[PDB]
Amino acid sequence: KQSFSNILEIYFHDGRTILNNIMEEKESNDRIKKLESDIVIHIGKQEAELALKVNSAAFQGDFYQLKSLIRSGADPNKTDYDGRSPLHLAACRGYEDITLFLIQEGVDVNLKDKFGHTPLFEAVKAGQEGVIGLLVKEGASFNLEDSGNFLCTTVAKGDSDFLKRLLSSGMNPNSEDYDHRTPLHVAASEGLFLMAKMLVEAGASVISKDRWGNSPLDEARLCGNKKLIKLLEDVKNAQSSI
């Protein structure tokens, strides 16, 4: 038995073929169909191990290991042990070829991570603009459970590029936070004209209220930046027109 263990270690693909024929003859004859629960457990554990292999390969890239694993028949839809899909992982590390192969492989383009991140979020945080474009052209969206407060925290961080990636992916920049708060209010209170302009490029909501019962006009005029108040007033008038 140990010798066969070494032989399957050096011939893992032939071991996969062995288990395939074992399944076929289990459904064929009345020898292996007896006590098939452990066989199902074994094939599940094996496929989990192959999922680890394919996710590590995509972590390093390895398009050649990608064709090796499609030859091995490992599950592409399955994520890694931790709970991160192969497309999320390929978004986290810059690899366009891996992402397009995953798209062609039927891997779910839009999915949540173990902690609940969309692949677009991984691309945005890791600076993968190309992966963001590929996800957009495929049609994936964030669908984050806390999109509002995440947008507000991004605004508080002040990173313009992060929110521009979010807008390119398609998120409503003025999405209400947990306490029905519009990020335009904190954006105007901070006073950075860049993010107010960015917030109104995709369509701001000055009409939308906040937890304070305030308006972005009031926050902008409290900050004192004249151009900020001017732009926010223009967007408020645009909202009032429609």
Next chain:
Amino acid sequence: IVIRLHEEYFLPGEVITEQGNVVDHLYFVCEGLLEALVTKTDGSEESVTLLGPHTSFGDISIICNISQPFTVRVCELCHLLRLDKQSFSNILEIYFHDGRTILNNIMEEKESNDRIKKLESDIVIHIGKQEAELALKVNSAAFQGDFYQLKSLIRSGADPNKTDYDGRSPLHLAACRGYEDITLFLIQEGVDVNLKDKFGHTPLFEAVKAGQEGVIGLLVKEGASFNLEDSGNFLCTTVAKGDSDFLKRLLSSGMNPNSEDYDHRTPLHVAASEGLFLMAKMLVEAGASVISKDRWGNSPLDEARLCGNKKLIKLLEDVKNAQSSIY
């Protein structure tokens, strides 16, 4: 290695090792002469090296973890000393610190004498992949909580400090599937306790996210408790979700309930923004601020009345009695 050895004599014409089959015994040549022979892609065998004195072959297979690069046939009567691969692995595992020198000196030879065993491809990537795959499978083991298997894997030549490639510590892996004893003696291996991952999630932040009390106790027992660059942000999100288990759980490690948010929003301010009376004052009982002026510059009482509850202001004043006595 010496105490486990055997000699053997081969007459001319025999083949000691075929390139096709995996090695099981590696042979040290002490007398006689023998020839190294890779199966040539032209459809023939050619010739590589004539290994007569104080030389061994088959080791490069035990390092590269692949088939034999060369078939090896004898030339004349040769006195060969033979060791099995199993005992070599079983001594490499216990003598792994002495085992590093094996791959080190074999590669520096492959650099110095390229005609010996360099005619193939790189091997350092293969050993790195062995280590990485062992790391992934010990991650799976920690997800499975096999104390015996995990101990055997770690003592078989594993570095406990190597976490998930993103950064999920083995504490993450044992806690995510609910393993307490696994978490404890895996963290007693010397692995770092503040191993924040790719995301910046603390081992204790992961524990509070995944909902396990045992890891909550254990990580505080070891030290390097829940730390973060943001305290009131996740606190306010959890208060909004109203996950009382998570609320007490973040407060269990003692994370600051008087901290700030994306703006100057204390978690007590968020609790006043919600409305209830039980969780609301669990933050000020740990030291949250009821006079923390917000980004506007107003005390939480003002937002408490703004949201639509004066009951809230009454609770805030019940907490503020001592402060007003100080005031």
Next chain:
Amino acid sequence: PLHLAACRGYEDITLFLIQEGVDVNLKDKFGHTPLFEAVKAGQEGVIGLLVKEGASFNLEDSGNFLCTTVAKGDSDFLKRLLSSGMNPNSEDYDHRTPLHVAASEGLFLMAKMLVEAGASVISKDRWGNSPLDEARLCGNKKLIKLLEDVKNAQSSIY
């Protein structure tokens, strides 16, 4: 044996100990439903497994423990008792619906998780008053506003 495996957090242990043929509705001397034991000790796996097998959480009282948990405000326990589908529209030691208790507390998130399962917002109490009256009595009118938000459909029926 489900109690013993669940108390120390064992999922696979619980499942094949329960596939041995042991009864699934084994209330103890205290009358603690195994699923009740699971909701008391805090384990999700047993929650799933016992419903998978059958003979789910059953009790002679539903609103009593629900009201006590609402008073304790254990949101995990609140969702957990509601996870098995135990009646949130039941009664108490008196005719005190769990929705009435939620109105007696004051908050807005947990309060309407019981009527989303089918709790009664017109359940007259032992006095004989709708929960709106106790909601205003406790000192909150927006509680009545939430109750009316739920009661819009009933008033359309009314």
